[PDB]
Amino acid sequence: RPFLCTWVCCGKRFTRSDELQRHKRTHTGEK
C-alpha cells in the first residue's frame, strides 16, 4: 500500500506505515 504524508505541504511518500509514522514524528506525535 502506498503511503503519503499529507501534513500541510510536506508530501512525502513511503511504502511502509512504520516509516510514515516514523516520519510523522518529525511534525507531531511525541512533540
Footprint of Zn ion (CB under 5 A): 5, 7, 10
What's the closest the beta carbon of residue 13 comes to Zn ion, in angstroms? 10
Nearer to Zn ion, 5 or 19 (CB): 5
Which CB, 1 or 8, lies closer to Zn ion?
8
Looking at beta carbons only, is 10 or 21 nearer to Zn ion? 10
SS3 content of the chain, % helix, strand, coil (to 5): 25, 20, 55
Q: What is the distance between the alpha carbons of residues 23 and 18, in angstroms, rounded to a whole number? A: 9
